[PDB]
């Protein structure tokens, strides 16, 4: 940005150095004010003009604005090219780049609307008369009765208003802190709840009277690949628009306006649409027979600029056939309003406002007008059937009208069309001749420019023989001729045509994100039947034998959108908690897997991408804990559920739990007992595939139908007793019959396309756009995942050894609770300190804290800030002195039973409590006459054989420990320290016979090793039990740990 500043300085020097000194003293404080105002007026698209300005300096200002505009535009495009390819950048760069490209798109839209106002309507009158009379003939062929205006009391207005207000309040239920303009909207919605009939009167008055509307705001959703607009509407108009949306869909569903080929439907998740499309391709009359030169053609395409090229007057003329005319005038009047972005106002006159409530109707009706242009009236009448007996989706009247025409399968998702043709030899030759008559090809150039699917192998995708390529070009030409280019436009570069012939053994398409390859049984090898996931087995309806296979993959745009979502998650700041990142990863991973259920297993690049993104997410937390890279890191830090203090991260990968990390220990009155309890369970095994979920849906709904038919005749109401088998089953879950809102949700028609079009109204992204839980029920179960996750990590006692739990002295876990979704970083680090601060995690570098015996592996400031707070004010030395004084008061009483003549407390040096190179004795006992000593043995060892080495002096030393997950065995530690400190030239002990008592604070363990005179060992066992139960300094340490961890009971 410094080069632009040097350029501005050079421009100002070239301006000021020409004028003399009496004008240098004036124009240094004259030009600089409006110099920024001219650039501001350019950026706000305001025409810059000021009187009293000379013309060469005005041309200099215009050259300055033009040069900075070119620099700014190329900088914005280069910044978008940096973040599109995946290069890392600061978040403020993307936040400014979104505004720059928002202003550029607004300048483009304001230009193209004025170009439409200047050049006139781009549609001719004859094409308008053609589509108008076509719609008239179609609606008179079906006897469609128009949608009436709701007069005074339709007796369903209350339920529709309730549904509209629920869909309006569905967005604001995420966060509990809102803005004032949002509080005003919630207040208006609550006032609409309080008085429904006044709200209905306001809606009907705005319908019959109002034609002017407040300005609609625009924002852009920041996808890394493609910008998408979100519109903001005034709430008083928004309530009326939502009620109009509900009433139009509920009337159009009853009047049967939409033919069954128009998709999405309310019955179907889009993978069911793909499955039924594959079954419809399979079940045709002799579809794979190519012995006489027949061909199959699969066209898929998209209507380019369908949303921007709708003329509003033509829309009103086509809309007045189906509703009341005031309703059509209200639907046209909302589209002609001023769009604002923060400085920029422009009116809308061409193209619809896609972010409206009722706009979900407008796209689905207008695109119906496209079906009369593409499919033809005769073939649409043969597909839909009579009005008194309509056909099903991908079904015909008879077989003769099925095979009477080549255009024999048709489907339209919102703007993507999928057509399937069956040609003979002579029809294909005639179509290729009709193509080559107008478009000759002397050099065979129609191979270059052919869109093909590179994700498949070379023998698996389309083989480009010349006849099949010419047939595909002819098919796309014949479809493109039927559409007037002023109304809609299809393009070859955005389309795809697959051909199945003698030279092409398999058929390809892309639909609903799925890459599908269909391959017949009779075009391949023998029976072998090795079962694979992502392989659908296709069978006939009549003979029920196998005919073909369907191979599923995930397309490239879904994987790129997922990788952009991972890059959005990795844009979290340093103050962001770890749990928010893990929750975003879990939401994204469920939104990937539960939609692409059976096809993630078949594609290998997505399985590599999931593991790569998961390791980047774990590395984001690894760098956040410590700056230095760890050599190892336990997965039980991550995959522990949030109830036990972990993160609850979902798994897609091959992670093996290492041995000797499933061990745990427990100390009781008989001593220290050890116990020993593998792969982390994956997500894809806990989700049903689509094919089994479809076959079971048909079964349970057939059994429901038979049970309902039996229950009607017996005067019996079906209850939970008869349906407690078919629970959790059906595509719409059977569980949805046991809604409280049956009469409420039964009036909601067309909910799936509305849920899909919520993306132009809400600023946040929407995973699970393809479903709604009240209408479908719930489509995954993950309690088994958490159960197997707790079971796979070695149990709760196996997890809690990593978690500093035994430093808190709670007897159980079940009565405990956390102080309140999210856990902070300090509490997480102090909780998982025994498994992070280990020797085999940060290799080599270790230090010691000053006033404690805590060994810090590496350096962790986020744990140091807690270990200073816990162990402040010499608590280590106070605990040591308290244990020494309590044991001295133990040895003070019961004097004659052990023949003790003098107990002596040694002068303890104030650094002795935490130095670990050497030690010294703490409590010295003098024998009255003589004491028999035993061999050096453990505290719990009872096989003691005493020697004749009678000694008088006895010494007792107290040692403290702060261990970790692998080194916390206090018995071998006390034995090693005894054998070290009794066999060295630096430690000082006045007696060769003694004992060392070791206490580990991080797990609260205690043991002893050394010599034993008679009567000393049960006394020391009971004394150390009494101390570990009743030391007040240990109680201060425990209450400080429980205060730091925020863990209560």
């Amino acid at each position: 940005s410094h080069f632009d500043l040097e350029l501005r300085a050079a421009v100002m020097h070239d301006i000021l150095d020409m004028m003399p000194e009496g004008i240098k003293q004036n124009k240094a404080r004259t030009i600089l004010q409006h110099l920024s105002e001219a650039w501001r007026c350019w950026k706000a698209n305001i025409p810059w003009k000021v009187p009293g300005l000379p013309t060469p300096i005005e041309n200099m200002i215009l050259r300055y604005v033009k040069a900075k505009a070119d620099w700014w535009t190329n900088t914005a495009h280069y910044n978008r090219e940096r973040i599109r390819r995946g290069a890392t950048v600061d978040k403020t760069v993307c936040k400014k780049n979104l505004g720059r490209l928002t202003r550029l798109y607004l300048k483009a839209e304001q230009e193209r609307q004025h170009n439409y106002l200047k050049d006139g309507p781009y549609i001719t009158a004859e094409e308008a008369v053609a589509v108008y009379t076509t719609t008239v003939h179609w609606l008179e062929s079906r006897r469609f009765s128009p949608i009436p205006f709701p007069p005074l009391s339709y007796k369903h207005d209350t339920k529709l208003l309730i549904l509209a207000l629920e869909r309006l309040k569905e967005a604001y239920s995420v966060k509990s802190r809102l803005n004032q303009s949002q509080r005003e909207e919630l207040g208006l919605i609550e006032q609409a709840y309080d008085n429904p009939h006044e709200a209905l009167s306001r809606i009907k008055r705005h319908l019959l009277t109002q034609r002017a509307f407040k300005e609609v705001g625009i924002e852009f959703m920041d996808l890394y690949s493609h910008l998408v607009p979100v519109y903001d509407v005034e709430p008083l108009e928004k309530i009326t628009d939502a009620y109009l949306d509900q009433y139009l869909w509920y009337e159009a569903d009853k009047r049967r306006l939409f033919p069954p080929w128009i998709k999405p439907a309310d019955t179907e998740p889009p993978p069911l649409l793909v499955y039924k499309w594959c079954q419809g391709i399979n079940n045709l009359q002799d579809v794979w027979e190519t012995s006489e030169g027949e061909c199959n053609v699969m066209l898929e395409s998209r209507f380019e600029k369908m949303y921007e090229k709708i003329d509003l007057t033509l829309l009103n003329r086509l809309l007045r056939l189906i509703v009341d005319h005031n309703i059509a005038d209200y639907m046209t009047a909302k589209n002609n309003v001023v769009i604002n972005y923060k400085d920029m106002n422009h009116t809308n006159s061409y193209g619809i406002i896609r972010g409206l409530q009722f706009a979900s109707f407008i796209v689905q009706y207008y695109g119906l007008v496209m079906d009369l242009l593409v499919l033809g009236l005769h073939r649409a009448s043969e597909m839909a059937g009579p009005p008194q007996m309509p056909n099903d989706f991908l079904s015909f009247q008879d077989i003769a009208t099925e095979a009477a025409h080549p255009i024999r399968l048709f489907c339209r998702y919102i703007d993507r069309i999928h057509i399937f043709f069956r040609f003979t030899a002579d029809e294909a030759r005639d179509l290729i001749q009709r193509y080559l008559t107008e478009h000759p090809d002397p050099n065979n150039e129609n191979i270059v420019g052919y869109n093909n699917k590179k994700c498949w192998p070379r023998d698996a995708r389309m083989r480009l023989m010349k006849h099949d390529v010419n047939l595909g070009r002819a098919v796309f030409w014949d479809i493109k001729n039927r559409l007037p280019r002023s109304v809609t436009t299809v393009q070859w570069e955005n389309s795809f045509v697959s051909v199945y012939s003698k030279d092409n053994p398999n058929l390809l398409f892309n639909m609903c994100g799925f890459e599908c390859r269909i391959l017949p049984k009779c075009r391949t090898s023998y029976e072998e039947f090795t079962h694979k996931d992502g392989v659908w087995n296709l069978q006939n309806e009549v003979t029920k034998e196998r005919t073909a296979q369907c191979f599923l993959r995930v397309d490239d745009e879904s994987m790129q959108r997922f990788h952009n979502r991972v890059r959005q998650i990795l844009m979290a700041s340093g103050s962001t908690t770890f749990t928010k990142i893990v929750n975003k990863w879990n939401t994204a991973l469920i939104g990937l897997m539960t939609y692409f259920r059976e096809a993630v297993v078949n594609t290998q690049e997505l399985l590599d991408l999931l593991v790569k993104c998961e390791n980047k997410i774990q590395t984001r937390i690894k760098i956040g804990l410590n700056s230095k890279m760890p050599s190892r890191f336990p997965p039980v830090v991550f995959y522990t559920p949030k109830e036990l203090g972990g993160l609850g991260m979902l798994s897609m990968g091959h992670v093996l739990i290492p041995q000797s990390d499933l061990r745990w220990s427990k100390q009781t009155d008989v001593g220290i007992t050890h116990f020993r309890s593998q792969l982390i369970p994956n997500l894809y095994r806990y989700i049903q595939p689509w094919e089994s979920e479809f076959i079971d849906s048909q079964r349970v709904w057939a059994e429901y139908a038979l049970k309902r038919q039996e229950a009607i005749a017996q005067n019996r109401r079906l209850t939970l007793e008869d349906l407690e088998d078919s629970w959790d089953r059906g595509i719409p879950r059977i569980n949805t019959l046991f809604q409280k809102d049956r009469h409420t949700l039964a009036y909601d028609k067309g909910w799936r396309v509305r849920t899909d079009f919520k993306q132009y109204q809400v600023l946040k992204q929407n995973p699970f756009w393809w479903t709604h839980q009240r209408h479908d029920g719930k489509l995954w179960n993950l309690n088994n995942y958490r159960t197997d996750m707790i079971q796979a990590l070695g149990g709760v006692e196996g997890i809690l050894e990593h978690t500093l739990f035994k430093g808190t002295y709670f007897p159980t876990w079940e009565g405990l609770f956390w102080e309140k979704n999210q856990i902070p970083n300090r509490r997480f680090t102090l909780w998982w300190s025994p498994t992070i601060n280990r020797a085999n995690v940060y290799v080599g570098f270790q230090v010691q804290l000053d006033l404690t015996g805590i060994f810090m592996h590496g350096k962790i400031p986020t744990l140091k800030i807690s270990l200073i707070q816990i162990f402040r004010a010499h608590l280590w030395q106070k605990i040591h002195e308290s244990i020494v004084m309590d044991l001295c008061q133990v040895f003070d009483q019961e004097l004659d039973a052990l023949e003790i003549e003098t107990v002596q407390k040694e002068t303890i040096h104030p650094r002795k409590s935490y130095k670990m190179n050497s030690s010294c004795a703490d409590i010295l006992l003098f024998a009255s006459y003589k004491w028999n000593v035993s061999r050096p043995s453990l505290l719990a060892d009872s096989k003691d054989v005493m020697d004749s080495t009678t000694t008088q002096k006895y010494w007792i030393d107290i040692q403290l420990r702060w261990g970790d997950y692998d080194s916390h065995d206090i018995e071998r530690y006390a034995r090693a320290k005894f054998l070290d400190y009794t066999t060295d030239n630096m430690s000082i002990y006045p007696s060769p016979t003694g004992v060392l008592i070791a206490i580990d604070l991080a797990y609260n363990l205690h043991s002893a090793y050394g010599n034993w005179f008679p009567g000393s060992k049960p006394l020391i066992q009971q004394a150390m039990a009494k101390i570990m139960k009743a030391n007040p300094a240990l109680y201060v340490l425990r209450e400080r740990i429980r205060k730091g961890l925020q863990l209560y009971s």
Partner: peptide, 28 residues
């Protein structure tokens, strides 16, 4: 075993997709 999540390519031989997936009982 230094962390290092691995890919599932080739590491599924006897594991299907629908296996070890259970449904819930009706509540009360």
């Amino acid at each position: 075993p230094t962390g290092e999540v691995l890919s599932l390519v080739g590491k599924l031989e006897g594991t299907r997709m629908g296996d070890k997936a259970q449904r819930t009982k009706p509540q009360m």
